[PDB]
Structure formats: structure tokens, C-alpha cells
Design an enzyme around this catalytic site. Sequence first.
Site, PDB file in Angstrom:
ATOM      1  N   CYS A  47       1.652  -2.500   1.967  1.00 27.45           N
ATOM      2  CA  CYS A  47       2.021  -0.766   2.807  1.00 27.45           C
ATOM      3  C   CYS A  47       0.871  -1.236   3.660  1.00 27.45           C
ATOM      4  O   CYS A  47       0.749  -0.359   4.504  1.00 27.45           O
ATOM      5  CB  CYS A  47       0.209  -0.197   1.605  1.00 27.45           C
ATOM      6  N   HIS A 195      -3.539   2.441  -2.249  1.00 26.24           N
ATOM      7  CA  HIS A 195      -2.981   2.391  -1.014  1.00 26.24           C
ATOM      8  C   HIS A 195      -3.305   2.339   0.358  1.00 26.24           C
ATOM      9  O   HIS A 195      -3.810   3.101   0.497  1.00 26.24           O
ATOM     10  CB  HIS A 195      -1.877   3.640  -1.283  1.00 26.24           C
ATOM     11  N   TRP A 212       3.315   7.791   4.150  1.00 23.64           N
ATOM     12  CA  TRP A 212       3.434   7.237   3.052  1.00 23.64           C
ATOM     13  C   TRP A 212       3.388   5.026   3.464  1.00 23.64           C
ATOM     14  O   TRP A 212       3.232   4.542   2.530  1.00 23.64           O
ATOM     15  CB  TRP A 212       3.531   7.374   1.974  1.00 23.64           C
TER      16      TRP A 212
HETATM   17  N1  LIG Z   1       1.552  -2.342  -1.114  1.00 20.29           N
HETATM   18  C1  LIG Z   1      -0.111  -2.410  -1.578  1.00 20.29           C
HETATM   19  C2  LIG Z   1      -0.730  -2.457  -1.730  1.00 20.29           C
HETATM   20  N2  LIG Z   1      -2.586  -1.946  -1.708  1.00 20.29           N
HETATM   21  C3  LIG Z   1      -3.156  -2.441  -0.848  1.00 20.29           C
HETATM   22  O1  LIG Z   1      -3.542  -3.410   0.004  1.00 20.29           O
HETATM   23  O2  LIG Z   1      -4.191  -1.029  -0.676  1.00 20.29           O
HETATM   24  C4  LIG Z   1      -5.226  -1.681   0.398  1.00 20.29           C
HETATM   25  C5  LIG Z   1      -6.346  -1.239  -0.291  1.00 20.29           C
HETATM   26  C6  LIG Z   1      -7.736  -1.717  -0.020  1.00 20.29           C
HETATM   27  C7  LIG Z   1      -8.636  -1.359  -0.680  1.00 20.29           C
HETATM   28  C8  LIG Z   1      -8.646   0.205  -0.613  1.00 20.29           C
HETATM   29  C9  LIG Z   1      -8.018   1.470  -0.749  1.00 20.29           C
HETATM   30  C10 LIG Z   1      -6.591   0.347  -0.207  1.00 20.29           C
END
Ligand SMILES: N#CCNC(=O)OCc1ccccc1
Length: 254
Positions: A47, A195, A212
Amino acid sequence: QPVVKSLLNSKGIHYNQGNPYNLLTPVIEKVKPGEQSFVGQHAATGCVATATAQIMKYHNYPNKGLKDYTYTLSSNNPYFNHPKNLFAAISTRQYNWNNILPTYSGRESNVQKMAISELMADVGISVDMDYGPSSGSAGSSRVQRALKENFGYNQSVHQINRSDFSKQDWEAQIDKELSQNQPVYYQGVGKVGGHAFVIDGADGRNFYHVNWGWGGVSDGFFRLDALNPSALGTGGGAGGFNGYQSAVVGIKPL
Ligand SMILES: N#CCNC(=O)OCc1ccccc1
């Protein structure tokens, strides 16, 4: 709050994490114990990569990459044999933004599919993506570094953390970006996981348009303290990305 219609929608930009976006991510090598096989399938782009790539497409930038990146996967990653090193020759890249299309329906040429897959893989590598059937990255702190150091975006690029601002000053910064036609990288954590996504619009009543990075699913208007897409959550409950929030702002080439 100024009204700003979705910037990414206006340019037709809708990316995802699977095919044909992930044709150049690492191919999964191992079955995780207790899990079904994903062996032989390309890892998800992540993501973080999908969010960043959509913003990069919005600017059609850079023309040329600036600096390579290399990193090593964590040895607790069960999908690869270890050690596993990844490398992207970003310093040699001349990205053809004619071939990196705003979205993909399947009918695109292999050249067009490889073009977005290359960008996706480069971005994922530059943020130390933990590749798998799902793929995770630290996000903001790595994104801001990658955009400037590897891809040559302006020094205006930086991470801001939600905890450092009042709600008014936080949203004012998002609003300023949108007023300058600059989509914002955004991420958060909650009870449906963590995410990363894109803020690219505002409706004047303190809701923001969110992309998203799921090919369009759940895109719409959300409060920044209620980033709760219905595509997630089994059991029928509530959940969203409302904690540990951060953004990358100032994203522009010049
Ligand atoms: N696709 C997928 C997995 N999610 C991700 O990498 O989120 C990054 C993330 C890091 C720290 C805080 C909030 C989101």
C-alpha cells in the site's frame, strides 16, 4: 475548508497492489507454515508503494531517476529464503509517463504493464518493502526520503506527524497542499491494521476525498479521524486508520 474535487479522479488515476501492478515484485519462494501456498506468485506491491506511485503519476515525475537503492529483507520473512537482497537501478531510469498509464483494465500492452510494474517495484524497494502476499513498509519516513533522494522531488517534501499539530493546524496543512494541486500521502493504524493512502480532495465540510489504492474500492469522502473504509472488517464491526497518523506533504517536482 476549501472545496477541491478529487485530484486523482480528475486524471483517471486508480492503481492497485496486484496484477498488472506487481509484475516485477519478488516472486514468493516459500510456503509459510500453516498457510496455503503463494509460491510462484508475485508479492503485493504494498500500500505504501501504491499510494506513492499514484502521486508520482499525478505529476508524471521524475523524467529520470537520481539514485539506486539496495536493502536486505528481514530474516523472519517466511516467504523468501535468506539472506535476500533487493536492488533497484533507479539512477538509470528514464520513466516513460506515456506508458505509465493512469489506470489499467487489462487490455493494455505488455510495455504499458511493465512500465507501471517497474515504477511500483522501484518505489517498493526504495521504501524497504517487506514483501509477501501482503507487503508492508514503515511508510512516511521512508517515502519522504525516497521521493527526494532517489526520485528527485523538491526539498519541500517532508513528513508531518498528527501528534505535532492541533486538528485545525493539521487540516490547514492538508488544505494548503490541495489548494496547490498537490495530493497528500497519508497513513494510519487501527483495529483493521495499518494502511497508506492518498488524500486528494475536500468537500468543504471537513471531509476529505481518499484514494485507498485498491483500484477504486471504498474511495470516497472521510473525516481524517474516521478513516474507516467498509471494504475492511470481518464480523460487521467498525475500524479505521485513526491512530499513529502521519502524512508526507510538499510533494512536487519543482
Ligand atoms: N499493504 C500493506 C501493509 N501496510 C503498511 O505498510 O502500512 C504502513 C504503515 C506504517 C506505519 C503506520 C501506518 C501505516
